[PDB]
Amino acid sequence: PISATMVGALLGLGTQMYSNALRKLPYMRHPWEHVVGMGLGAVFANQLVKWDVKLKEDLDVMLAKARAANERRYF
Amino acid sequence: PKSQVTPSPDRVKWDYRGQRQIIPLGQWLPKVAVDAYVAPNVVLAGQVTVWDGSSVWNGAVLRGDLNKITVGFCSNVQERCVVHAAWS
Ligand SMILES: CCCCCCCCCCC(CCCCCCCCCC)(CO[C@H]1O[C@@H](CO)[C@H](O[C@@H]2O[C@@H](CO)[C@H](O)[C@@H](O)[C@@H]2O)[C@@H](O)[C@@H]1O)CO[C@H]1O[C@@H](CO)[C@H](O[C@@H]2O[C@@H](CO)[C@H](O)[C@@H](O)[C@@H]2O)[C@@H](O)[C@H]1O
Ligand SMILES: CCCCCCCCCCCCCCCCCCCC(=O)O[C@H](COC(=O)CCCCCCCCCCCCCC)COP(=O)(O)OCCN
């Protein structure tokens, strides 16, 4: 399937080539920073997914607390 | 009438560096865009501006020592073309 690692790598390579294009430079100007961008994109995508899961868990807990607080009105 | 010359013993008969393509004259430095292609044989002297998409081909000399020389967007100067500027 489409994992966070591959989409992150594609986004990193794309943003490196996009930065190179915006400066009128060749797309594959410095290959090493293309590799660095792929790695950073993969890392950022994985961290984003890991943070999203925890964020949803925290939101669920906080909504449970809010609903519990609201339910006390009927007593 | 003289008919007499004095050869210099420090004159260089072979420059291992070759001819330098960009020749700044004092504070005038030729400006070449990163998108522009300038052939390695080209000589750019003085205030010469080469813009995006422009191209200068083999053997061309662009001496902007006297007045400014400008090459526009996607405009090309082909092989062995001498572009020079006068005071007026
Ligand atoms: C802009 C590009 C558009 C691309 C998106 C569409 C393409 C589809 C890919 C979307 C994608 C990557 C997101 C890319 C981020 C973009 C990069 C940002 C910039 C980077 C430069 C996330 O997509 C999935 O992520 C899930 C969250 O986990 C969510 O499911 C919801 O979650 C619940 C909440 O708790 C909801 O309650 C519930 O309703 C849903 O179940 C959904 O978001 C979705 O199903 C692919 O999934 C990837 O993440 C996880 C799977 O989860 C995989 O690893 C996991 O790790 C542990 C979990 O940490 C798990 O323990 C582990 O078992 C698992 O292996 C990865 O291997 C990979 O599969
Ligand atoms: C989010 C949607 C998804 C987007 C895709 C994300 C993908 C993950 C990120 C991929 C990034 C790829 C980058 C590859 C590495 C190249 C970095 C090399 C930079 C470098 O060598 O340092 C000098 C410049 O520093 C720099 O250029 C550093 C610039 C940093 C700018 C932003 C700094 C952080 C600001 C906080 C985030 C932005 C705001 C967000 C709210 C270079 O110097 P030189 O040789 O070029 O010459 C002098 C120019 N100065």
Tab-separated table of C-alpha atoms and ligand atoms in Angstrom:
chain	number	residue	atom	x	y	z
A	1	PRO	CA	0.000	0.000	0.000
A	2	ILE	CA	0.898	3.691	0.337
A	3	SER	CA	2.957	3.975	3.516
A	4	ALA	CA	4.054	7.181	5.212
A	5	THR	CA	7.690	6.392	4.384
A	6	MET	CA	7.229	6.438	0.608
A	7	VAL	CA	4.901	9.451	0.500
A	8	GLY	CA	7.330	11.316	2.745
A	9	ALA	CA	10.267	10.418	0.506
A	10	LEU	CA	8.374	11.575	-2.585
A	11	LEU	CA	7.419	14.847	-0.882
A	12	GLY	CA	11.030	15.428	0.168
A	13	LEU	CA	12.377	14.780	-3.320
A	14	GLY	CA	9.627	16.957	-4.768
A	15	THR	CA	10.345	19.876	-2.455
A	16	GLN	CA	14.073	19.632	-3.185
A	17	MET	CA	13.452	19.664	-6.941
A	18	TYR	CA	10.880	22.451	-6.474
A	19	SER	CA	13.395	24.568	-4.559
A	20	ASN	CA	15.979	23.943	-7.279
A	21	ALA	CA	13.490	24.908	-9.998
A	22	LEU	CA	12.451	28.102	-8.195
A	23	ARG	CA	16.081	29.300	-8.345
A	24	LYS	CA	16.464	28.634	-12.107
A	25	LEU	CA	18.860	25.781	-11.283
A	26	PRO	CA	18.795	22.283	-12.782
A	27	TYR	CA	16.462	19.889	-10.995
A	28	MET	CA	19.219	17.464	-9.951
A	29	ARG	CA	21.747	20.116	-8.971
A	30	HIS	CA	23.049	18.645	-5.694
A	31	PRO	CA	22.098	14.949	-5.385
A	32	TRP	CA	23.216	14.679	-1.753
A	33	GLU	CA	20.641	17.193	-0.557
A	34	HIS	CA	18.039	15.360	-2.645
A	35	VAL	CA	18.843	12.256	-0.588
A	36	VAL	CA	18.733	14.351	2.592
A	37	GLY	CA	15.343	15.721	1.566
A	38	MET	CA	13.989	12.232	0.919
A	39	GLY	CA	15.138	11.103	4.358
A	40	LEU	CA	13.730	14.179	6.090
A	41	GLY	CA	10.404	13.800	4.296
A	42	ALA	CA	10.121	10.158	5.334
A	43	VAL	CA	10.962	11.046	8.940
A	44	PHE	CA	8.476	13.929	8.998
A	45	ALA	CA	5.660	11.832	7.523
A	46	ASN	CA	6.215	9.024	10.030
A	47	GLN	CA	6.336	11.518	12.904
A	48	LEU	CA	3.168	13.189	11.610
A	49	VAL	CA	1.268	9.889	11.617
A	50	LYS	CA	2.598	8.996	15.072
A	51	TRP	CA	1.555	12.416	16.375
A	52	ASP	CA	-1.865	12.213	14.709
A	53	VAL	CA	-2.695	8.942	16.479
A	54	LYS	CA	-1.799	10.365	19.901
A	55	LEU	CA	-3.622	13.611	19.106
A	56	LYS	CA	-6.811	11.714	18.269
A	57	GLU	CA	-6.489	9.678	21.474
A	58	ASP	CA	-6.115	12.856	23.537
A	59	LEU	CA	-9.105	14.433	21.790
A	60	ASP	CA	-11.199	11.343	22.542
A	61	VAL	CA	-10.227	11.472	26.223
A	62	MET	CA	-10.980	15.190	26.458
A	63	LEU	CA	-14.374	14.823	24.761
A	64	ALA	CA	-15.180	11.989	27.162
A	65	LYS	CA	-14.350	14.350	30.029
A	66	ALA	CA	-16.494	17.120	28.522
A	67	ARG	CA	-19.480	14.813	28.009
A	68	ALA	CA	-19.116	13.498	31.563
A	69	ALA	CA	-19.099	17.074	32.867
A	70	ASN	CA	-22.182	17.950	30.810
A	71	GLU	CA	-24.059	14.831	31.945
A	72	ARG	CA	-23.867	15.999	35.576
A	73	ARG	CA	-26.369	18.772	34.776
A	74	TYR	CA	-29.256	16.284	34.934
A	75	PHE	CA	-28.637	15.492	38.618
B	1	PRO	CA	61.325	56.454	-37.297
B	2	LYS	CA	62.353	53.929	-34.628
B	3	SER	CA	62.275	50.368	-36.051
B	4	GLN	CA	63.382	49.159	-32.614
B	5	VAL	CA	61.530	47.140	-29.970
B	6	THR	CA	62.585	45.778	-26.576
B	7	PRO	CA	61.256	42.259	-25.902
B	8	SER	CA	60.236	41.660	-22.298
B	9	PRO	CA	61.971	38.741	-20.529
B	10	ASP	CA	59.006	38.254	-18.162
B	11	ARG	CA	56.453	37.945	-20.979
B	12	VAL	CA	54.438	34.728	-20.793
B	13	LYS	CA	54.326	32.649	-23.980
B	14	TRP	CA	51.918	30.032	-22.580
B	15	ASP	CA	49.313	30.727	-19.892
B	16	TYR	CA	48.460	27.395	-18.269
B	17	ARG	CA	45.227	28.983	-17.015
B	18	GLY	CA	44.191	29.727	-20.587
B	19	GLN	CA	42.048	32.737	-21.346
B	20	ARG	CA	39.809	33.771	-18.465
B	21	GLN	CA	36.201	33.958	-19.633
B	22	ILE	CA	34.982	36.615	-17.169
B	23	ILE	CA	37.285	39.643	-17.153
B	24	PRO	CA	36.285	42.292	-14.598
B	25	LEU	CA	37.430	45.839	-15.322
B	26	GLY	CA	37.841	47.594	-11.995
B	27	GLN	CA	34.460	47.481	-10.275
B	28	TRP	CA	32.617	46.409	-13.455
B	29	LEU	CA	31.994	42.660	-13.197
B	30	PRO	CA	30.068	40.865	-15.974
B	31	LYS	CA	26.782	39.448	-14.698
B	32	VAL	CA	25.704	36.087	-16.130
B	33	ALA	CA	22.400	34.509	-15.151
B	34	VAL	CA	22.448	30.940	-13.858
B	35	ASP	CA	19.980	29.952	-16.598
B	36	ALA	CA	22.107	31.514	-19.354
B	37	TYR	CA	24.614	29.428	-21.310
B	38	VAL	CA	27.970	31.040	-22.108
B	39	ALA	CA	30.415	28.959	-24.115
B	40	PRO	CA	33.817	28.339	-22.483
B	41	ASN	CA	35.542	30.049	-25.429
B	42	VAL	CA	33.592	33.299	-24.891
B	43	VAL	CA	35.244	36.412	-23.453
B	44	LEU	CA	33.103	38.821	-21.413
B	45	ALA	CA	34.970	42.012	-20.504
B	46	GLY	CA	33.704	45.040	-18.622
B	47	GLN	CA	30.053	45.668	-17.784
B	48	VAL	CA	28.213	42.966	-19.734
B	49	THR	CA	24.832	41.633	-18.601
B	50	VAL	CA	23.471	38.281	-19.789
B	51	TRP	CA	19.897	37.531	-18.755
B	52	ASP	CA	17.820	34.386	-18.314
B	53	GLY	CA	17.454	32.078	-21.294
B	54	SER	CA	20.121	33.995	-23.210
B	55	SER	CA	23.004	32.170	-24.849
B	56	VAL	CA	26.444	33.194	-26.105
B	57	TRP	CA	28.241	30.807	-28.437
B	58	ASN	CA	31.819	29.923	-29.319
B	59	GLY	CA	34.296	32.645	-30.210
B	60	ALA	CA	32.035	35.545	-29.253
B	61	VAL	CA	33.601	38.634	-27.680
B	62	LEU	CA	31.411	40.983	-25.626
B	63	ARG	CA	33.599	43.926	-24.585
B	64	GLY	CA	31.619	46.295	-22.393
B	65	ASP	CA	34.697	48.293	-21.443
B	66	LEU	CA	33.422	51.594	-22.851
B	67	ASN	CA	29.641	51.479	-22.375
B	68	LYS	CA	27.102	48.933	-21.138
B	69	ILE	CA	26.205	45.776	-23.069
B	70	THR	CA	22.945	43.936	-22.374
B	71	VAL	CA	21.621	40.670	-23.822
B	72	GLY	CA	17.911	40.129	-23.296
B	73	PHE	CA	15.666	37.246	-22.330
B	74	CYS	CA	15.951	34.238	-24.681
B	75	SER	CA	18.101	36.311	-27.058
B	76	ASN	CA	21.189	34.577	-28.419
B	77	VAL	CA	24.559	35.761	-29.726
B	78	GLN	CA	25.914	33.093	-32.040
B	79	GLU	CA	29.390	31.903	-33.001
B	80	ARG	CA	32.264	34.389	-33.283
B	81	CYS	CA	30.173	37.535	-32.850
B	82	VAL	CA	31.870	40.721	-31.649
B	83	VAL	CA	29.574	42.957	-29.592
B	84	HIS	CA	31.135	46.285	-28.631
B	85	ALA	CA	29.957	49.588	-27.180
B	86	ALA	CA	31.103	53.146	-27.866
B	87	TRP	CA	31.107	56.265	-25.714
B	88	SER	CA	28.462	57.999	-27.838
C	1	LIG	C1	-0.250	15.125	1.957
C	1	LIG	C2	-0.024	13.756	1.255
C	1	LIG	C3	-1.391	13.020	1.118
C	1	LIG	C4	-1.205	11.507	1.402
C	1	LIG	C5	-2.421	10.987	2.203
C	1	LIG	C6	-3.223	9.974	1.339
C	1	LIG	C7	-2.304	8.744	0.988
C	1	LIG	C8	-2.639	7.539	1.987
C	1	LIG	C9	-1.458	7.398	3.031
C	1	LIG	C10	-1.962	7.942	4.438
C	1	LIG	C11	-1.036	7.413	5.599
C	1	LIG	C12	0.299	8.300	5.661
C	1	LIG	C13	-0.043	9.802	5.910
C	1	LIG	C14	0.901	10.699	4.984
C	1	LIG	C15	1.136	12.078	5.652
C	1	LIG	C16	1.498	13.118	4.549
C	1	LIG	C17	2.979	13.557	4.714
C	1	LIG	C18	3.047	14.957	5.421
C	1	LIG	C19	4.330	15.715	4.952
C	1	LIG	C20	5.547	14.733	4.960
C	1	LIG	C21	6.740	15.389	4.246
C	1	LIG	C22	-1.870	7.531	6.991
C	1	LIG	O1	-3.283	7.212	6.708
C	1	LIG	C23	-3.856	6.425	7.622
C	1	LIG	O2	-3.369	6.839	9.016
C	1	LIG	C24	-4.242	6.331	10.111
C	1	LIG	C25	-3.643	6.736	11.437
C	1	LIG	O3	-2.904	5.659	11.954
C	1	LIG	C26	-5.616	6.883	10.012
C	1	LIG	O4	-6.611	5.792	10.312
C	1	LIG	C27	-7.417	6.226	11.339
C	1	LIG	O5	-6.628	6.256	12.598
C	1	LIG	C28	-7.463	6.391	13.811
C	1	LIG	C29	-6.890	7.490	14.679
C	1	LIG	O6	-6.454	6.940	15.890
C	1	LIG	C30	-8.915	6.718	13.494
C	1	LIG	O7	-9.662	6.753	14.720
C	1	LIG	C31	-9.523	5.707	12.581
C	1	LIG	O8	-10.755	6.258	12.034
C	1	LIG	C32	-8.633	5.321	11.455
C	1	LIG	O9	-8.178	3.967	11.666
C	1	LIG	C33	-5.913	7.442	8.698
C	1	LIG	O10	-5.290	8.767	8.607
C	1	LIG	C34	-5.395	6.604	7.566
C	1	LIG	O11	-6.014	5.332	7.619
C	1	LIG	C35	-0.636	5.861	5.332
C	1	LIG	O12	-0.581	5.122	6.594
C	1	LIG	C36	0.695	5.083	7.206
C	1	LIG	O13	0.552	5.302	8.657
C	1	LIG	C37	0.299	4.076	9.489
C	1	LIG	C38	-1.130	3.627	9.314
C	1	LIG	O14	-1.880	4.023	10.430
C	1	LIG	C39	1.248	2.934	9.167
C	1	LIG	O15	2.103	2.611	10.342
C	1	LIG	C40	1.369	2.449	11.489
C	1	LIG	O16	2.181	2.893	12.652
C	1	LIG	C41	1.417	2.819	13.919
C	1	LIG	C42	0.490	4.008	13.999
C	1	LIG	O17	1.159	5.085	14.627
C	1	LIG	C43	0.594	1.539	14.019
C	1	LIG	O18	0.737	0.998	15.342
C	1	LIG	C44	1.039	0.516	13.033
C	1	LIG	O19	0.211	-0.673	13.187
C	1	LIG	C45	0.932	0.994	11.629
C	1	LIG	O20	1.763	0.165	10.793
C	1	LIG	C46	2.147	3.269	8.055
C	1	LIG	O21	2.883	2.079	7.671
C	1	LIG	C47	1.392	3.787	6.867
C	1	LIG	O22	0.405	2.816	6.484
C	2	LIG	C1	4.657	20.884	5.031
C	2	LIG	C2	4.140	20.302	3.717
C	2	LIG	C3	5.122	19.253	3.202
C	2	LIG	C4	6.343	19.946	2.604
C	2	LIG	C5	7.414	18.906	2.285
C	2	LIG	C6	8.257	18.651	3.533
C	2	LIG	C7	9.379	17.671	3.199
C	2	LIG	C8	10.332	17.569	4.386
C	2	LIG	C9	11.360	18.695	4.303
C	2	LIG	C10	12.293	18.441	3.123
C	2	LIG	C11	13.343	19.547	3.064
C	2	LIG	C12	14.397	19.191	2.021
C	2	LIG	C13	15.644	20.038	2.258
C	2	LIG	C14	16.886	19.218	1.920
C	2	LIG	C15	18.074	19.727	2.731
C	2	LIG	C16	18.616	21.012	2.112
C	2	LIG	C17	19.039	21.957	3.234
C	2	LIG	C18	20.367	22.623	2.885
C	2	LIG	C19	20.368	24.045	3.439
C	2	LIG	C20	21.792	24.460	3.799
C	2	LIG	O1	22.703	23.803	3.422
C	2	LIG	O2	22.020	25.592	4.594
C	2	LIG	C21	22.141	26.841	3.960
C	2	LIG	C22	20.787	27.546	3.941
C	2	LIG	O3	19.996	27.050	4.981
C	2	LIG	C23	18.656	26.863	4.630
C	2	LIG	O4	18.320	26.971	3.499
C	2	LIG	C24	17.619	26.521	5.695
C	2	LIG	C25	16.256	27.021	5.221
C	2	LIG	C26	15.192	26.693	6.264
C	2	LIG	C27	13.990	27.612	6.059
C	2	LIG	C28	12.934	27.338	7.128
C	2	LIG	C29	13.577	27.291	8.513
C	2	LIG	C30	12.595	26.658	9.494
C	2	LIG	C31	11.395	27.586	9.670
C	2	LIG	C32	10.275	26.847	10.399
C	2	LIG	C33	9.386	26.138	9.380
C	2	LIG	C34	8.837	27.155	8.384
C	2	LIG	C35	7.585	27.813	8.961
C	2	LIG	C36	6.526	26.746	9.229
C	2	LIG	C37	5.419	27.333	10.100
C	2	LIG	C38	22.673	26.724	2.532
C	2	LIG	O5	23.254	27.939	2.163
C	2	LIG	P1	23.537	28.225	0.570
C	2	LIG	O6	24.701	27.387	0.111
C	2	LIG	O7	22.312	27.865	-0.230
C	2	LIG	O8	23.871	29.821	0.350
C	2	LIG	C39	23.402	30.743	1.291
C	2	LIG	C40	21.878	30.747	1.315
C	2	LIG	N1	21.424	31.309	2.573
